[PDB]
Design a protein around this ligand. Sequence first.
Ligand code: PRO
Ligand code: PRO
Lengths: 329, 329
Amino acid sequence: SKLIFVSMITRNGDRAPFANIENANYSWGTELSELTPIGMNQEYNLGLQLRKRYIDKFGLLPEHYVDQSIYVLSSHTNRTVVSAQSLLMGLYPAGTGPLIGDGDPAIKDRFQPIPIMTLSADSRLIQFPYEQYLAVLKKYVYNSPEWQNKTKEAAPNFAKWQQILGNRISGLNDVITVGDVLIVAQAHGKPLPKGLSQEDADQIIALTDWGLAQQFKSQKVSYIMGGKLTNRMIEDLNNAVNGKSKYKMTYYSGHALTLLEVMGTLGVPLDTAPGYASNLEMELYKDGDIYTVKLRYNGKYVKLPIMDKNNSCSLDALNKYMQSINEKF
Amino acid sequence: SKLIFVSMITRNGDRAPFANIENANYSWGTELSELTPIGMNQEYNLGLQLRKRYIDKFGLLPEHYVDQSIYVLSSHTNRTVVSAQSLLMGLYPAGTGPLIGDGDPAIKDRFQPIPIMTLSADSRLIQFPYEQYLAVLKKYVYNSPEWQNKTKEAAPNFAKWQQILGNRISGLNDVITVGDVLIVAQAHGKPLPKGLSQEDADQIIALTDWGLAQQFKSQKVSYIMGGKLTNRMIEDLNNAVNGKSKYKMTYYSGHALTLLEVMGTLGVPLDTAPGYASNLEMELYKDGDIYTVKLRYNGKYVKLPIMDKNNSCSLDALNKYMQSINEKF
Ligand code: PRO
Ligand code: PRO
């Protein structure tokens, strides 16, 4: 059985936060929401790793980029485009790019350009529009028993946290909001805000991780946001078999929620929120007329309910599995 | 007076053709419509030249890329994205990209990622949808006196050209179709199709050049297709003065028609079809409260009807001029 196609999602690399903690004066060196040099490096290294896997080990992809062999589609954000570019700088690194004339590089250092398309900003495929996302949470998540129970447990800390950080804190949603800033601060080795102990920072960060993952423990929520992309990825697999497409890989450059909503849709929701440059791959294998699929997340295979002891299932079985999810929602 | 903002359009670099000449067996080394290594090189060199101009000479832009300083928007084609990427590898070359840790490169060779967004495929901003374009030609161009006169002149050659090339040739539109293939062949040093003399190839290519430019000698045609982008570029200039934007440059990665339609809209239509990596810049200058604009095309300033002996006009004058064009169409 040989690997014949992969569909992949990444979360972007390390970025600045989206907003500030009111009572801290952090300086990021990068504009809000933008990918940092650290984030470029993370994606670049993921690219190098993917080269070792999909080029060197499996030989699915060649050492020099073949035009139209990879379809790359990004959400409409700078960080996801730059993340995909950085990753592709690892997958097809300097030295492998095209030559002109008598073996002279088309671009200095033999860089390899690989096209990246972006969705429109209003597309719901990779990044669910924020207001619609929050509306989904308000309706399906915030009043769920699990969210209410966790709110009750965390609630006695809200007043203290609000007074320390300055930002409004009146529910788990607000905890997640400031939690992302603290995650970025920690990732950049910044000191704690004055009066926020490490213990408290740890609690806020833990609640943030818990909250993000909890949202997608609901398959219904996951499907609303991720059903479209999950269907599309499986259709990509089908297209590598039915002759509709000649791509060796489709790559969707996305966000933490993109990974969460797909894993959640497939009925294997993540226990923890995806870190920077987290990634999932649907791998399609061929042995004559037998097609098999495996699902890899952050370097480890994942067993869907329909999979055998070897974390594998037929592509037919995956189609039937997805079909039933579609019918369910 | 100091340069404070530039808006730029490029045509993509050298590409394979869109279709084949039936009676030739050309091999391109690249898929149809895709940018070639030569095209990557052309755009990369254009980038280097733009660095010498807008970074070294004018000092508008810094030597190291500032996030959110340049807005790059491409049509939804591989060649325009890859052309923009290649250009940006010249504008902000290896060695200038970000560092992490203790002066260690974020990406090997200090590559600089710069985000590129794409329009949707159905957007009319940069690339007018092909069928709609042809509809515009059929209605406004093909029956114009100039088109009919040239048709009558060229018509005695159609039978011969069709029999030699194989492709249908029954009007100037068909000449332009095969003419692009001959342009690509010549650019790649391919031999002529059997039975097509150099004289005949020269005639077909000259008609192709003439035809493409002729379309935009009509300001009405130019405005239908290019009014939106022309207005947008001037609005970019306004945004650099009114405080609405902090970009130093907006860059629209487009096609021959993109250049043709904007130049045509401005009432300065091109005499000849834009070659690969042709480019235009709207330059905005500031001396206190006085704002002046210049228009550069392929390395030379262009005098709009409203400009003085020095190829310059006030931004106020440019707005009024565009306002009247809008009112006219
Ligand atoms: O997660 C956030 O807070 C930002 C807001 C729009 C989507 N990303
Ligand atoms: O010019 C051409 O022929 C191709 C067809 C769609 C637009 N570009």
